[PDB]
Each structure stands twice: as structure tokens, then as C-alpha cells.
Amino acid sequence: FLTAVSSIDTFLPVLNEAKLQWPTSALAASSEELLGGYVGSQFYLQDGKYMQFQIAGSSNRCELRQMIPDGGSEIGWAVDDGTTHTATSSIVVPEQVDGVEEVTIMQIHSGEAPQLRISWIRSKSLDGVAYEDFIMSTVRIGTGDSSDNFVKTHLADRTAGAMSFQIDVKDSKLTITVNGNVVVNGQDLSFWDGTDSCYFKAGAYNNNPTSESATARIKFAALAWVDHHH
Numbered sequence: 325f326l327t328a329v330s331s332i333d334t335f336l337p338v339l340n341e342a343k344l345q346w347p348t349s350a351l352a353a354s355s356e357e358l359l360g361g362y363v364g365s366q367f368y369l370q371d372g373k374y375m376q377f378q379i380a381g382s383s384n385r386c387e388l389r390q391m392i393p394d395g396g397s398e399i400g401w402a403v404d405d406g407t408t409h410t411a412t413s414s415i416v417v418p419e420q421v422d423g424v425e426e427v428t429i430m431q432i433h434s435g436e437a438p439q440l441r442i443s444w445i446r447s448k449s450l451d452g453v454a455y456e457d458f459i460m461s462t463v464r465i466g467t468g469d470s471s472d473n474f475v476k477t478h479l480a481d482r483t484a485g486a487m488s489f490q491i492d493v494k495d496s497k498l499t500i501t502v503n504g505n506v507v508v509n510g511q512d513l514s515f516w517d518g519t520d521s522c523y524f525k526a527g528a529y530n531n532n533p534t535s536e537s538a539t540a541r542i543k544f545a546a547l548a549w550v551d552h553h554h
């Protein structure tokens with residue numbers, strides 16, 4: 325039988341501050357249900373150690389969505405509210421099966437758009453350089469479809485071992501730290517000033533697969549939203 329993520333202590337803080345969306349953005353498990361042992365092949369404890377997410381299908385997800393703690397409703401914050409908003413993780417991204425092309429593993433999202441996606445991607449060229457099997461950041465600086473609406477950055481080549489991530493937003497600026505090194509330093513998010521519906525997400529969100537049957541799989545060794553106000 326599949327062991328539940330809540331059976332160890334590692335993820336209890338974030339589970340108290342998240343709902344699980346699966347296989348779409350529909351509710352799969354409330355925070356209370358997650359803390360109460362919700363489990364399935366899409367969301368279970370791997371190796372007694374990893375919160376593992378799995379999903380197949382284009383634009384499908386198995387993803388935690390930040391909630392107000394202690395049974396609260398959906399959170400919404402703003403990049404320019406003056407507070408530092410922080411998400412941390414330690415992620416083992418396994419080799420992805422054929423047909424999986426891009427897996428979003430952390431986000432800042434709002435009511436209408438992704439401000440940031442951190443994603444694994446099989447193969448892509450950025451600013452004239454081809455990259456394979458790597459972790460990328462995609463920041464939106466507008467809602468249009470043309471490339472000038474995005475800033476897309478190679479963060480790191482995928483590693484077999486755990487990779488640490490931290491996302492910080494303060495005063496309309498974004499920093500991303502990977503394995504302890506700042507890779508995105510103060511990216512401008514001021515396009516989003518006044519949008520009060522932002523929130524963190526993390527898990528597996530499957531983008532542009534070439535087979536809808538192919539199952540994306542992502543293992544979290546750690547995940548938290550870090551409250552600077554205590």
C-alpha cells in the first residue's frame with residue numbers, strides 16, 4: 325500500500341498551508357485532508373523521505389497551492405505589499421519518461437497568470453544557446469504572447485541529487501537561489517504591482533507533452549512557505 329506524505333513530520337508545515345489540486349485545478353485534498361493522510365499514486369511518500377507528485381496529460385497537474393494556514397482559504401498577496409514572500413524547496417527531479425517535455429515544479433501564480441514558473445525542460449534554446457535536461461525560470465513581465473512578455477533563464481542543469489531552490493519576492497523584485505547561489509538577482513516584477521491575488525505553488529504541472537499518457541514524476545525532499553512575520 326502507498327504511504328501517505330503526512331506519515332512523517334517533514335512536510336507537515338506546508339501541508340498545513342496548502343491544498344492539493346489534481347488532476348486539474350479542481351480540489352483533490354484540502355489542507356485538513358492532507359494532514360489527515362490523503363494518499364494516492366499521484367501523491368505519496370517515496371523512499372520514506374520524498375513527497376512525490378505524478379501526473380500525465382497536457383496541462384494537468386498534481387500541485388500544492390498556497391493557503392492561509394490552519395484550515396484557511398486561498399491566500400492572495402502582492403509583489404508590492406512590502407513583505408518578503410519566500411518559498412523554499414529541495415527537489416529530486418528524476419529522468420523524465422519519453423513524451424514529458426516540460427514540468428513546472430514551483431510557481432508564483434495569480435488569479436489570471438503565472439508570474440513565475442520554475443520548470444524542468446527537456447530541450448530548449450534561450451538567447452541563442454541550446455540547453456538540454458535543465459531547470460529554467462520563466463517570468464512574465466506582461467500578459468501578451470510575444471517573447472517580450474517573458475524573461476526566460478537557464479537556472480541549472482538537472483542533477484541526479486537533490487537541488488535546493490528558494491524564491492523571494494520583495495518590493496516588486498524577484499530573486500531565485502539554486503543550491504545556495506543567486507541565479508536570478510532582483511528581476512523586476514513591477515508589472516504586477518497592485519495584483520493582490522498572487523500565491524505560491526509547487527508539485528508537478530505538465531506542459532506541452534508529446535504524449536498525454538506519459539507520466540511526469542517529481543520528488544520533494546523539502547518544501548515550505550517561509551513567513552517573515554512570525
Ligand SMILES: O=C(O)[C@H]1O[C@@H](O[C@H]2[C@H](O)[C@H](O)[C@H](O[C@H]3[C@H](O)[C@H](O)[C@@H](O)O[C@@H]3C(=O)O)O[C@@H]2C(=O)O)[C@@H](O)[C@@H](O)[C@@H]1O
Pocket residue numbers: 438441448449462464469471474476531532
Ligand atoms: O523558446 C521559446 O522562447 C518559445 O517560447 C514559447 O512561448 C512560451 C512562453 O515562453 C511560456 O513558456 C508559456 O508558458 C505557458 C505554459 O506552457 C502553460 O501553458 C501555462 O503555464 O501558461 C504559460 C504562459 O502562458 O505563460 O508557453 C509558451 C509556449 O508555447 O511554450 C513560444 O513562443 C515558442 O514559439 C518559442 O519558441
Ligand SMILES: O=C(O)[C@H]1O[C@@H](O[C@H]2[C@H](O)[C@H](O)[C@H](O[C@H]3[C@H](O)[C@H](O)[C@H](O)O[C@@H]3C(=O)O)O[C@H]2C(=O)O)[C@@H](O)[C@@H](O)[C@@H]1O
Pocket residue numbers: 345348349350351389398433435525
Ligand atoms: O486554469 C487553471 O486551471 C488555474 O486554476 C487555478 O485555480 C483556481 C481555479 O479557479 C480552481 O477551479 C479552483 O477554484 C476554487 C477556489 O476555491 C476559488 O477561490 C473559488 O472561490 O472557488 C473555486 C471553486 O469552487 O472551484 O482553485 C483556484 C485557485 O485559485 O486556487 C490555479 O490552479 C492556476 O494555477 C491555474 O492556472
Ligand SMILES: [Cl-]
Pocket residue numbers: 325326327328368369370
Ligand atoms: Cl508509500
Ligand SMILES: [Cl-]
Pocket residue numbers: 371372373
Ligand atoms: Cl529509503
Ligand SMILES: [Cl-]
Pocket residue numbers: 418419420421539540541
Ligand atoms: Cl520520471
Ligand SMILES: [Cl-]
Pocket residue numbers: 411430431432491524525526
Ligand atoms: Cl513556489
